[PDB]
Write a protein that binds this ligand. Structure first.
Ligand SMILES: C[C@H]1O[C@H](O[C@H]2[C@H](O)[C@@H](O)[C@@H](O[C@H]3[C@H](O)[C@@H](O)[C@H](O)O[C@@H]3CO)O[C@@H]2CO)[C@H](O)[C@@H](O)[C@@H]1N[C@H]1C=C(CO)[C@@H](O[C@H]2O[C@H](CO)[C@@H](O[C@H]3O[C@H](C)[C@@H](N[C@H]4C=C(CO)[C@@H](O[C@H]5O[C@H](CO)[C@@H](O[C@H]6O[C@H](C)[C@@H](N[C@H]7C=C(CO)[C@@H](O)[C@H](O)[C@H]7O)[C@H](O)[C@H]6O)[C@H](O)[C@H]5O)[C@H](O)[C@H]4O)[C@H](O)[C@H]3O)[C@H](O)[C@H]2O)[C@H](O)[C@H]1O
Ligand SMILES: [Ca+2]
Ligand SMILES: [Ca+2]
Ligand SMILES: [Ca+2]
Ligand SMILES: [Ca+2]
Ligand code: NA
Length: 483
């Protein structure tokens, strides 16, 4: 069966402590529609109860210790999470955990540290003389004590921070100490993009490297995870990420599929990341997200023949995770660049019914977003579910592409004799509707095919040579399959 990932959260999920129970209750539904793996949000204790998990305080607290004024995380308790994972696994759905290793947030106390300021546009350049600051770097875990790990964090485990508690000023501070320097290799944007936010972990420090590998193995084992989503990969030493993934795989004996978030609209830089990590993990296809967004926002003027230009999926199809939108590109968020609603079903047909890429469905697109703008994403599950059914049951076999018009483009799948009645013909258009003659395979000659989306009511008959004349409405999608 075709694999399909689902990101199971949106930025504005409520702080009601019931998210793990929601997931548990949705397991049957997710398996029924064709989801084969779920990416869950960071499940460890953040600097406050309402943190989404990207300001992680204690990686060993999965919602069971009294820290930061709460036992549960935003999403629920550890036992609730283990019950959700149990329900998914009983329905043959895998679970990938989000891993936030670039920084730590919410230190228990400050420490005195010697530091220099650096140029925000070129972090290799020092711009001040050294001086003393008070940085938030002492992590003691008073609610956990030494349960699971007795490692405590201090300033010397970090490379820098962006807040001095003594003068109350925000600058990028690089710490002074033995062999201190920004890590390499990382993105060369801003000269060196190791520093992002909070207290930056030093992956040159051998105890830190060793402890982080130990945590990785503990986390995969405690929750029985099947893979990972690596946060902020452009900001973490590439050879460390390569080796950390290898160490967890070696210790568990599992495949541990891994996808890294390397946020850059440039395939060449993404290819460098793949090379530097020995092709041992996939990346999200950022360039394809931006091509889909561009097509959705040009009112029909985009040249649809160019949708695959510059994308990771056109060059490295087995190492790409394709997506339409996520918790950062949704309205009001940090990487806001939402695919407009009218085009969203066409974008989902493009990533779910083509042979290359491992597609991701976004929670926010299925169930709607609950942010406070006048442009939230509406719930589109009724439009996406028929496309997921097309992937689950019909998108198999040889593919033929028809990117030969500036508005109307399409592709077909001949089907596979081992999946009964498989085969499909998809057409999308960013402009007026029309038709296209496409080949679906002589083995499907004389069959009656119909649009599974319900957008067109007229069925199409495949001629004796394996060709059909397919139609599509304006600004729409049609996916024809065996009636
Ligand atoms: C989002 C994306 O970002 C990056 O992408 C960039 C990209 O790489 C770049 O290229 C560019 O992109 C271009 C593109 O290339 C172009 O082509 C295209 O066209 O345009 C784009 C541009 O749009 O730009 C991109 C954007 O910059 C990155 O590459 C991606 O990977 C990334 N995506 C992923 C990564 C993420 C990060 O993990 C996710 O980000 C999300 O979450 C972030 C974290 O929440 C969020 O960050 C923002 O918000 C943060 C809050 C902020 N932190 C600062 C704030 C601080 C304090 O608030 C500060 O904290 C320090 O100081 C505190 C003291 O004030 C101290 O706390 C102590 O005191 C307090 C009081 C104590 N708490 C007490 C209170 C209580 C509560 O009642 C009690 O509970 C408690 O008991 C009590 O004690 C505490 O205990 C004390 O410790 C702290 O300790 C101290 O650390 C901090 O240091 C500050 O940094 C961030 O800076 C801000 O950025 C992001 O916005 C979210 O998006 C993302 O989701 C991932 O997918
Ligand atoms: Ca370093
Ligand atoms: Ca870093
Ligand atoms: Ca067009
Ligand atoms: Ca057939
Ligand atoms: Na670092």
């Amino acid at each position: 069966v075709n694999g399909t990932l689902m990101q199971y959260f949106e930025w504005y999920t409520p702080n009601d402590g019931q998210h793990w129970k929601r997931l548990q209750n949705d397991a049957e539904h997710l398996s029924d529609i064709g989801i084969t793996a779920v990416w869950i949000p960071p499940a460890y204790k953040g600097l406050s109860q309402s943190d989404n998990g990207y300001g992680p305080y204690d990686l060993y607290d999965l919602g069971e210790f009294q820290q930061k004024g709460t036992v549960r995380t935003k999403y629920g308790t550890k036992s609730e999470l283990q019950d959700a994972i149990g329900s998914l696994h009983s329905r043959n759905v895998q679970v990938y955990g989000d891993v936030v290793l670039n920084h730590k947030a919410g230190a228990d106390a400050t420490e005195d540290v010697t530091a220099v300021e650096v140029n925000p546009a070129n972090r290799n350049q020092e711009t001040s003389e050294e001086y003393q600051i008070k940085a938030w770097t002492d992590f003691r875990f008073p609610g956990r004590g030494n349960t699971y790990s007795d490692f405590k964090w201090h300033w010397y485990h970090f490379d820098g921070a962006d807040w001095d508690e003594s003068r109350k000023i925000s600058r990028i501070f690089k710490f002074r100490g033995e062999g201190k320097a920004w890590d390499w290799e990382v993105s060369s944007e801003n000269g060196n993009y190791d520093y992002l936010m909070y207290a930056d972990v030093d992956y040159d420090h051998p105890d830190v490297v060793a402890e982080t590998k130990k945590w990785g193995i503990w986390y995969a084992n405690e929750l029985s995870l099947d893979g990972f989503r690596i946060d902020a990969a452009k900001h973490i030493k590439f050879s460390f990420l390569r080796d950390w993934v290898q160490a967890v795989r070696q210790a568990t004996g599992k495949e541990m599929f891994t996808v890294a978030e390397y946020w850059q609209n440039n395939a060449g830089k993404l290819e460098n990341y793949l090379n530097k990590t020995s092709f041992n993990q996939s990346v999200f296809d950022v360039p394809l997200h931006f091509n889909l967004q561009a097509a959705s926002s040009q009112g029909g003027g985009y040249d649809m023949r160019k949708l695959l230009n510059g994308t990771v999926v056109s060059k490295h199809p087995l190492k790409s995770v394709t997506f339409v939108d996520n918790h950062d590109t949704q309205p009001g968020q940090s990487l806001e660049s939402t695919v407009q609603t009218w085009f969203k079903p066409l974008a989902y047909a493009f990533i779910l019914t083509r042979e290359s890429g491992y597609p991701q469905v976004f929670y926010g697109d299925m169930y709607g977003t609950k942010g406070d703008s006048q442009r939230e994403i509406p719930a589109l599950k009724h439009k996406i579910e028929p496309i997921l059914k097309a992937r689950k049951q019909y998108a198999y076999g040889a593919q033929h592409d028809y990117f030969d018009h500036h508005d109307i483009v399409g592709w077909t799948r001949e089907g596979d004799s081992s999946v009964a009645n498989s085969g499909l013909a998809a057409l999308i258009t960013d402009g007026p509707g029309g038709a296209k003659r496409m080949y679906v395979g002589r083995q499907n000659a004389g069959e009656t095919w119909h649009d599974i989306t319900g957008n067109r009511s007229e069925p199409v008959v495949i001629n004796s040579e394996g060709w059909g004349e397919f139609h599509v409405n304006g600004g729409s999608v049609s996916i024809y399959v065996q009636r």
